[model samples]
Target: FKNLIWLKEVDSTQERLKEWNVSYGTALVADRQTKGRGRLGRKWLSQEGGLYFSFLLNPKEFENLLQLPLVLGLSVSEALEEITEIPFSLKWPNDVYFQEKKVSGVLRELSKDKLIVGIGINVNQREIPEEIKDRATTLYEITGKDWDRKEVLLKVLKRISENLKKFKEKSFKEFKGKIESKMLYLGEEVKLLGEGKITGKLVGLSEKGGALILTEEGIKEILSGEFSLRRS
Candidate 1:
């Protein structure tokens, strides 16, 4: 924990870590982020009492880089569930959900040959904004108790480190299976947001790529840009 760079505040951990040019697994955690980012450049409301950090990664170890997001989901969900004893599932690619409400989200950025995995968890936030209140819930909100952010961070970091090692050792099929089990909308019809509006049944994950959805025609692997999931 002390080995990682601690920033009292930063515009974004991803941005700062990119500047640091550190080796893989170097973590840049912060007390607060002023301009935290989400998928598709959405602004994440980062503040104290929440977990905000980025892990620098090298691409050589993660040959199946496309699956890294889902791998992160598996690591985070297990860590949080272990501590809270409350189950959490993944919302496709990289969102963590507790009873269909988002409790954590992940974003990744790449520079040169390095990757930065940025993660945000609603650890002890007692209240979220009204705009996201319907779709978002914090650990405090769900458990009715405040949590120590540092404890959650340490657990997540440890879990991520352990999983990264396993990711290299295990086959792609293994992680794909585990991630599929925790999928949010498995077997349910939902809207895939990229093109116009493609509605399909969430069959499962592709072998080593995008989501596999069963449309009217057949199962299609969507590997496009950011795809949001919603009820059809």
Candidate 2:
């Protein structure tokens, strides 16, 4: 609560927090993220009036570090659905879907003892490019109504905080089941972006994250879960 604040824009909230001495759960939220980012140094497509915020944390209690992405994805999904009155499909690892199209995304930076959880959601936007058009969706499309940006921001932050509070408990073990149940490509035929052809049924996931089992060699373990591509 004391760690949350609203700002007009910033270069990087994670960087700012590093300059300060603080405890866990330090949050730097902004109305707009001028230079928002994605994982592996990719650019997160940020728009004005959408939710763009990051949480500064030090999770010494998370047993499987990989599960944090999916766990965070689930929280964001619930938060968006609660506010917009629509369901969201939490695509593996870190993307959130509305009606099968991506509406939100997440990024994390793990340093020595800190993890910056950065999230972005598209709300009230109607038009997206053709390349990303099929893959992206927004709250305005789902609810058919414009929303108050501030209210949505508050709702998501509350949900994230609530879920984060439970992340250290053994009760959080259920997060794996919850995450697997919401995967978009879990039970369907699919192909990895770079990896060669592999036919395998989705048998869920490993406790340490990676993707749920979607492989050809009966059940294979994935090293990462990065979701993006142009449908052919």
Candidate 3:
């Protein structure tokens, strides 16, 4: 719609772009998504009135944009804090939480150098199921105030545009402190959900990119893909 193809609904924005063979910068948004998603193929909630959308832009040109996702994650968190002005934080790698309840997530699919960034944020929703209640939250619940979804989205997009431009020029140093500051499980003993279930000292993420950082067995790098974090 805004110089890019926009769809109101699709099974998966990441998939739709692939099927349609659309060019980059195309976006798919939905008011009601039946099967919402998250990173590492987690089953996500699409609770009504939440932020549910995806970005389809080829990152091939920016082969180094992979780490930019982590940078962009901070940008999304920044927009949320600015709009709602509530105390929100980020889990390592990528996840938005309030009062320890997750309110949003991000995912990206790159094929043939094309990048599709998928994001889902819980904005002004009212109810969350008991199952995900411990880990999911909404803006209204966290702030006791409602927000205009479009307004928040616009801010997020604007910030993203700015961040992307800056990322192309410099390293992700500017985002390192912010990412570590918002870390939820920092300085705690966290278990690595790896093949052998190794335990590591959670030291938080490094200024350099490569998943979240866990110091154990001589500083093991932990990427969230196919791994979960547990308190030790």
Candidate 4:
């Protein structure tokens, strides 16, 4: 949590970080967001009880931007595991899940020289809207207790820092297998929500292109984008 900026309320942590142009690795955390967002411009409700933050990083040397989300998820999952010992697995792209409900999400955007990673975790939230109640969850709900948000924040930041360093050194090759093991839909029937519906069984990720490889019946497919993912 070094070089961290804290705000009680903001339009969005990601938008604030974009304006700051601060040094790489600086993070902006907000207690409330009037316009938080998820992937594909979806609105993310950010109230007082959740964790919302965005961090800046230079991605010039990384070979694959698509793989960063998986890396970030692994970092978060590890940090959470070390603290609570609860099992957390990663959904495709960048959602972290526990017991089939999403506990956190990550969205990354590339600017002129920096990559901004916006992360939201349902830490101490006490309620969920009926619309998404079944699809979303909070740490408090899962554990039946509230957590020290600051402690988890420190652990997540430190884990992210170490993972970013590994990405810089191209050390992800050693971690890809572990990332795969935590994958949610690796062998499940899934749909790549790009242009149209393309459904298939997810094989794994490609090493060269960093695309999600799928096999449908007897053919191989490769898909990537700021697209949606769903089990179909």
> How many residue pairs clash in each candidate at the backbone level?
0, 0, 1, 0
For each candidate, the alpha-carbon lDDT, in order, equals: 0.82, 0.68, 0.69, 0.79
Write down the worst ten-residue block by lDDT for model 3: 58-67
Global lDDT for candidate 3?
Answer: 0.69
For model 1, how does the per-residue alpha-carbon lDDT over 1-232 read when each residue is reduced to its tens digit? 2357778999999888778777665678888888888877888988778889898777677753458888888889999999999989898777899987899998888788877789999988765888888888999988889888878888998888888887788866767888888889888998888666667998888887578888898888877546777866
Residues 173-224, candidate 4: write the lDDT tens digits.
8567877777776688877767666667767766532445455455454536
RMSD of 1: 1.8
Q: Model 3: how large is the Cα RMSD against the reference?
A: 2.7
- Which ranges of candidate 4 are over 4 A from the true structure? 208-214, 217-223
Q: Of the pair 2 and 3, which is ahead by TM-score?
A: 3
Model 4 collision count: 0
**Model 2: per-residue lDDT, tens digit, 1-232?**
3456677887666555656555666567766666666776656656566777777666566533467777778888887778776777776667788766888887777666766677788887666667778778778777788888767777777777777678766555667777877777666665556444334555666766666454544677766545432222
Instruction: Using TM-score, give the best candidate's number.
Output: 1
RMSD of each: 1.8, 3.0, 2.7, 1.9
- For model 4, state the Cα shift of residue 180 in Å: 0.8
> Which residue pairs come into collision in candidate 4?
none
TM-scores of all candidate predictions against the true structure: 0.93, 0.83, 0.86, 0.92
TM-score of 1: 0.93
Candidate 2 has an lDDT of 0.68
Tens-digit lDDT string for candidate 3 (67-178) = 5666667888889888777777776555667757888786777767567787888887887889888777788887888888777877887777777767677767766777
Superior candidate under lDDT, 1 versus 4: 1
Q: List the residue pairs that clash in candidate 2.
A: none
